[PDB]
Amino acid sequence: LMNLKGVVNSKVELEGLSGSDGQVVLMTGYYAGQYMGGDHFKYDSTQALINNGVTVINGWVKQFSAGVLTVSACGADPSASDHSAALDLAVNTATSLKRKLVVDFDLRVNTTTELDATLRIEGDGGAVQFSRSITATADIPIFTVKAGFSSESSYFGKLMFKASTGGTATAFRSTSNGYLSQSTFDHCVFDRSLRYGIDANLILCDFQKCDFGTYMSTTNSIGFKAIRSLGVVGTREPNANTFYNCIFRKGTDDCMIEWDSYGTQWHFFACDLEQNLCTEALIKCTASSPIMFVGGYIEANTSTPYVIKTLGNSATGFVPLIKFQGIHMNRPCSVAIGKNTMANYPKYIFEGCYGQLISAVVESSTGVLNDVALIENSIANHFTLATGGSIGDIRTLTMPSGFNADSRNFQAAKITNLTSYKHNYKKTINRDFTVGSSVGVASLSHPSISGASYGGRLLVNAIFGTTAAAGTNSAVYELLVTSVGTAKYISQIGSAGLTSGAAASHPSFTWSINSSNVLVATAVGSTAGRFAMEVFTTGNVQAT
């Protein structure tokens, strides 16, 4: 038969207590007056001199009656002002033992804790702002990501990160651009008292309903940025970071989210980016690969110029597409939603977005607002224009006259009602003539078969000057053209306007085709000066 040896109230009373093999004792709390970290202990004479402070304490082996490793069982004193060394022993023990770590009371740390690989740490606190919290009492990262991949694989479940002094510290920081790789942030809250929510090189990390800056334990006057992932081009780039139902509120730095090194695949599913006060943009990134917003909100950012601003050199890499798929955007920014610093890229898709604008939709690298050349598609969008808002030629539900996209190429199309006046159209300007001189207008060729015999119709509108206006001398010519080898065939079907050259400014010309298949215009009568032609082709001929 075996009886209970006794009960102890602290770890100091356990190490000084002597026993024999098989004896079991009850410890009520790691420290006196506490109930946390307590556990049953069985004595082992083989390890009587072993005392690591957690599992074995001078022969007393932890029995894990609760089946869970807690930070209190590693020396975390709730009455103490600091728990840094206790947390370090907790991460080292939980990872070396290959078991999850549980934070059972709010910790306060003044020294960083390096993130050991495969760390799974969870909190048993309340919901959202009353979750199990870890506060940084100094201007130091709560966790330090190791260099290279030494911190790869981790799990952070329902933990809150605060700072004792507003505008200091961060939850994570990387040494030598170390990778915070293959991690999960489940319902983690990042208090606005932090200077940076996450200042580590993130890769392959998913965020499940995290919160950045909604709640604020102490006032932050320096600034708050949600994420800053800085890496190295080619070897350590911030990649594959997805956000589900996350919230980004009350930012005060130059941007809320930032990453460089042409990091790839940052996407936001049903996220909420509102009530920020960023000075430049909500997302400032030197990135490649597309960036997509699948549902969510981008609103209430009246003082932020841009929603997203891409940087870098397009020769090295670029974002091809930024898609806003069904985003509620009630005043998302103040200047333009998408700001480009490279030419042409990125393109934008606004699919079913809804809200009111005090800004432009996009801005090119040269400052052109609402550049349709940057609009890959714009369908089913509803935008009301407030003071400062503009859409330009971009199509909306209330502005059907705009364009859905810049260009589309199809191999076939059936359009019932088509409106296109510059169809097979070519413009040639600065056609300077003297009396009776000849000037080439365009080159004729078969549009499908190279070097083949062409044949079609030409509508030429010649005017005096460069661009037509009210009272501009005009003339129209209808020409049938075709070729058989060196033989050129042109027939003027008709004409109208000032076609006789009664004055120098009259666009009067006779048409021919030379040996180079060039449509040549010869001045008629007194015609002389600078003219401009516009050719509209039909059939098996093109004017280039």
Residues 208-237 that bind Na ion (CB under 5 A): none
Token code pair at residue 90: 């907790």
Q: How far is the CB of 484 from its own copies (least distance, A)?
A: 5
The per-residue b/e assignment along 514-529, b for 16 or more CB within 10 angstroms, e otherwise, is eeebbbbbebbbebbb
Which range touches Na ion (CB under 5 A), out of 40-48, 156-164, 189-197, 460-468? Answer: 460-468
User: Interface with Na ion includes 542 (CB under 5 A)?
Assistant: no
Q: What's the CA gap between 422 and 536, in Å, rounded?
A: 7
Residues 78-137 that bind its own copies (CB under 8 A): 94-95, 98-100, 102, 104, 117-120, 124-131
Measure CA of the first residue to CA of the last residue in the chain; give whole Å: 105
Q: How far is the CB of 69 from Cl ion (least distance, A)?
A: 15
Nearest to 257 by CA among 185, 310, 220: 310
DSSP assigned state of 453: P
Q: What's the CA gap between 171 and 121, in Å, rounded?
A: 14
Residue from 17, 159, 226, 333 binding its own copies (CB under 8 A):
17
With CB under 5 to 8 Å by kind, the binding choice for 408 among its own copies, Cl ion, Na ion, none is its own copies
Sign of torsion, CA 500 475 456 454?
positive
- In 205-363, at which residue ranges do the beta strands (DSSP E only) sit? 205-208, 211-212, 225-229, 241-244, 247-249, 257-263, 266-274, 281-287, 291-299, 306-310, 321-328, 336-340, 347-351, 354-357, 360-363
Residue from 25, 54, 91, 271 binding Cl ion (CB under 5 A):
91
Residue 441 φ then ψ, to 5°: -110, -50
DSSP secondary structure, 18-30, as one string: ---TT-EEEE--S
CB nearer to its own copies: give 162 or 347.
347
Binding mask 322-361 for its own copies (x = CB under 8 A): -x-xx-x---------------xxxx-x-xxxx-------
Q: Compute how many other C-beta atoms are within 10 angstroms of the C-beta atom of residue 368.
A: 15
Residue from 424, 428, 508, 527 binding its own copies (CB under 8 A):
424
Residue from 468, 490, 503, 518 binding Na ion (CB under 5 A):
468
Q: How far is the CB of 272 from its own copies (least distance, A)?
A: 6
Total number of residues binding Na ion (CB under 5 A)?
4
CB nearer to Na ion: give 9 or 154.
154
User: Interface with Na ion includes 55 (CB under 5 A)?
Assistant: no
Q: 56 with 47: CB under 8 angstroms?
A: yes
CB nearer to its own copies: give 242 or 280.
242
User: Interface with Cl ion includes 136 (CB under 5 A)?
Assistant: no
Q: How far is the CB of 518 from its own copies (least distance, A)?
A: 17
The per-residue b/e assignment along 457-475, b for 16 or more CB within 10 angstroms, e otherwise, is bbbbbbbbeeeeeeeebeb
User: Interface with its own copies includes 470 (CB under 8 A)?
Assistant: yes
Q: 37 with 73: CB under 8 angstroms?
A: yes
- In 67-222, at which residue ranges do the beta strands (DSSP E only) sit? 69-70, 101-103, 107-109, 113-114, 119-123, 132-136, 141-145, 154-157, 159-163, 168-174, 179-181, 184-186, 189-190, 194-198, 201-203, 205-208, 211-212
CB nearer to Cl ion: give 44 or 114.
114
User: Interface with its own copies includes 66 (CB under 8 A)?
Assistant: yes
Our CA angle for 453, 458, 460, nearest 5°, is 145
Residues 110-129 that bind Cl ion (CB under 5 A): 114, 116
Pairing of strands 141-145, 168-174: parallel
DSSP secondary structure, 489-505, as one string: EEEEEEEEES-S-SSTT
CB nearer to its own copies: give 3 or 221.
3
CB nearer to Cl ion: give 116 or 260.
116
With CB under 5 to 8 Å by kind, the binding choice for 114 among its own copies, Na ion, Cl ion, none is Cl ion
Our CA angle for 246, 247, 249, nearest 5°, is 160
Which range touches its own copies (CB under 8 A), out of 75-83, 226-234, 252-260, 493-501? Answer: 493-501
Q: How far is the CB of 127 from its own copies (least distance, A)?
A: 4
Task: Please report where in the chains the tokens 């804790």 appear, as a residue.
Answer: 113
User: Interface with Na ion includes 239 (CB under 5 A)?
Assistant: yes
Which range touches its own copies (CB under 8 A), out of 76-84, 219-227, 242-250, 432-440? Answer: 242-250
Residue from 235, 303, 313, 491 binding its own copies (CB under 8 A):
491
R_g of the chain computed on alpha carbons: 36
Residue from 366, 416, 430, 515 binding its own copies (CB under 8 A):
416
Q: How far is the CB of 536 from Cl ion (least distance, A)?
A: 27
Q: How far is the CB of 468 from Na ion (least distance, A)?
A: 3
Q: How far is the CB of 492 from Na ion (least distance, A)?
A: 20
Residues that bind Cl ion (CB under 5 A): 91, 114, 116
Residues that bind Na ion (CB under 5 A): 239-240, 468, 540
